Design a protein around this ligand. Sequence first.
Ligand SMILES: [Mg+2]
Lengths: 144, 53, 134, 182, 260
Amino acid sequence: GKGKPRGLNSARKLRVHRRNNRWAETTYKKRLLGTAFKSSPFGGSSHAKGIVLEKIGIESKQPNSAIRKCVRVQLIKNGKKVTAFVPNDGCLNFVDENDEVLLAGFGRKGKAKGDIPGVRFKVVKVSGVSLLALWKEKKEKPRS
Amino acid sequence: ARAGKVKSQTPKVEKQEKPKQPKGRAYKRLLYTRRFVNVTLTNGKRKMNPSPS
Amino acid sequence: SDAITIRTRKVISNPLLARKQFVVDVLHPNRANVSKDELREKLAEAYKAEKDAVSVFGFRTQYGGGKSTGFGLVYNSVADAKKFEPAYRLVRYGLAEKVEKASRQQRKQRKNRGKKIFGTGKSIAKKAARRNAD
Amino acid sequence: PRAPRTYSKTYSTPKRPYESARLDAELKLAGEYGLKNKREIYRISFQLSKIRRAARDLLTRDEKDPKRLFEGNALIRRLVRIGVLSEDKKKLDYVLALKVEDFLERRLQTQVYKLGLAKSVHHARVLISQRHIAVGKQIVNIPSFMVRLESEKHIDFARTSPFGGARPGRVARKRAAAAGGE
Amino acid sequence: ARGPKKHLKRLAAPHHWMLDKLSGCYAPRPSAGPHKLRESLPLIVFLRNRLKYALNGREVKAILMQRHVKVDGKVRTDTTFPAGFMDVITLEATNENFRLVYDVKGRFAVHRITDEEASYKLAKVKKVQLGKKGIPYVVTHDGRTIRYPDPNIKVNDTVKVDLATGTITDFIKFDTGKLVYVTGGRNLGRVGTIVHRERHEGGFDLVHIKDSLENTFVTRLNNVFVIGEPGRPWISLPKGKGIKLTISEERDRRRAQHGL
RNA sequence: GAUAGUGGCCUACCAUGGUUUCAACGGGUAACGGGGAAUAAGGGUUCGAUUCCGGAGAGGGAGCCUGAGAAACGGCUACCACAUCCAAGGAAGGCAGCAGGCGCGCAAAUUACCCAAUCCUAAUUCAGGGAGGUAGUGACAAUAAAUAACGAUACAGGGCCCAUUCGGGUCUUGUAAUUGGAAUGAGUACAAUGUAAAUACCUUAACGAGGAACAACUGGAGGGCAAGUCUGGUGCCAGCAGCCGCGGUAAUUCCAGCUCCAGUAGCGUAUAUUAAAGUUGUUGCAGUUAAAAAGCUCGUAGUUGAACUUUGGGUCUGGUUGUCCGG
Ligand SMILES: [Mg+2]
């Protein structure tokens, strides 16, 4: 009989029911338990800034198997470490390690992208330049 | 590491001075006239991409 | 050609500043921005009063000429105009002139330093000369 | 600070991004109409959409309430003034089906066209788009202007914009001095 | 806070002053004076806005200082003065005078008046008591107070005050079949007669009111105000008779003989 | 007692009791509260740092004088913080006020000119006001569209006249990558303005369009999802890619080129959040197996409840509609 009560003095039980069952759809859980600010070192940060440590390359997953051009960064605003990427074939050596870098996220919401294991971030700004420039040779990289 | 190669082997072809595409209002007028005047000379279906090859 | 036939609209004749206020429409034909002084002189013919009895300001055209709009004040005589009518407009008319107001930073610095001194201190000036001489 | 100033958007992006029949329909509207872009279509569309919203919640209630008998009659008075509908249809219910094209009927692009002196409508686009006009002697500048259905008879050429009581101007005069005057 | 307010934005103004939502952002805080702020009219506003005689704040101060305006004979040099209700504002130059009479819809309107009626004022009774010496006295919410009132006048009636001295020439009591007038909120600004002296005590006396055309409604008491005998109210109310007409009759009237 | 005063506001002496599972204080708020903003069948979910309306705060915390009014802060006193000049004896200070700088950041501008507006201030029209006024820094969002258009020509399939073949085949794109005048603001500048000084427009004198030019752009071109097996190179590496899946010797996806394809000063990228979601469903979910029916009952709290009392007949009509040749 539609085991949700319907009698014309319901309002209270309706509210408590719906607001003890919001806790399924995660998006609500992340917003209100808020750990999207506590952990997830990019504190709701549509970007961040950090510095490079030393370039590494990790094996990829199933059938698509190759070296996938990986980077190791430590942020500055909190002091936390992640692993990022370089698109646009070359320009993996625009690194010049100990140069800073401006990171941004993928699109799969911290869940991994494509084939890569344990990586979350592109790079669109770095050391005052945007990779779209040099890889199309619009600007020219100043050195640090 | 061994990356950065494709642009090394790429042919370095250059641009072609082709007469400007009349960017702007002319562009819409041209797409209209080309697309929707000539129903003849069909290509099985109207294949928009007929090549010289 | 030029040959304008000026006109005014919304005429008010108010003695509470001993004047008349109106809005002036002016015909452009084939001549840009009919040049305030000419409007002043034509008004001098129109109201037949003293020439300097006109202060017209705020012109805008019609986006491709044609006519232009302004707001015009005819004082019944020079007097109340001289008295209450704010300075700037008369400055620009050339009747009265514009004082040198010391620039904003200038006046501020002056007044603050005057704050810092208590009483016109001729005594403190000569005393300081004497003492720093020591 | 100052009394706040206000927004108003005037185009919207349909949910379906890309489907042919539409695409071709609007391009065709350009073909018989001379559009700059598809922004003109989206703006005329959003305008249409709110008109229809108005008519819907007009007819949702009952009839003979003063609310309709005033606001509906005024809305249709506005429209019969601009020139989209026709007098034989002053019933507020043809309004539910204006069929976007109809608004476009009354733009000085094709208003000049079907008024002539346009010669292949885009030439009318040339005339109107830059200061070669005369409408109210308020020399219009945008052809998304919606003539008020009565000043349309004034539509002519101004004292600039030659062939109609002007002086050639800034190129033709150059060549007239270069050769014609000499 | 920590004391009163001196500065007034351009927004928190009441609607009825007919603002402009442009041209600056600091509107005249009317001077703390006789009437209530949130309804009072400022004279400067009366001039630049409606009259459009002074074109600028300095112009207002200018015209005031030279003393051609008078709040009921009194000078009142200041700008932010609270001009009030059915009062008298004389402009000796131009030989014209004004009465603060409402229009139909709810905001203050101009009205020239004959010099005759310009003599006096028609104010509301608020309170009557005996002060020190036991002397009898009356307080009107239209500012003034009068000592030794006419004896019969109880609360909530109308007194015609000369303002030439401070003396009563007549008064009107509060009864059914009395042309009565309102100053109340959502239906503020309507000529009327009491069809019923509804009481409902314990709080907020209410009155049921017919218009001239048998279109009744209800208003809270204090915002009502008696205005004259049937067929003859004492003031000379403007066109409109406070009736709150129908929108369509309005458009027909507005556009019937279209030359405007 | 104190307070302008009510009052456990405070004190003395008795009464010892109010509070709630229709949520008590607790803990957190990446929350000052709200009129509103986004969202677009209808319910709703999220944002509210602010153009308002109030409220609280001017290092953080106590106390006070003055004044109708302040626990004030461009008033002061005083602890621990920041701390600015010296002759080692206290010294002027508190920018979350304007304008800049400082460290920090995903990141916000000019040590601009001004009281003409706006109004507000205190002995008052004039005096005063980084309150704010006029400009620069101004792609946070917006609205309006400059990116060429028309002629005389020498052609094709089909528009059109017939058929070996005058073309009476008159329009089109392919394209001519033929050919000429026409017209401009983009930009430049005297003038009147125009804002007192100061935008800029608007008018505008004059200059200034015939192809490189005054040069459109970012993303794609396998499926959504709009158009490629057209050409070259690389060949399990490179690279792609929101998903799928393309990468192992003609890639229709890569790298280029050409040809195309969307909106047009705009577009993509990146994070949070709304419709699609009927995957939060109250109006609208599921529960035999798939994401669970507590093991069953009792059993307080809410939540809901059998039927049954003036029906019915008469009442003149008060007005209005299907309404009655149509004035
Ligand atoms: Mg031109």
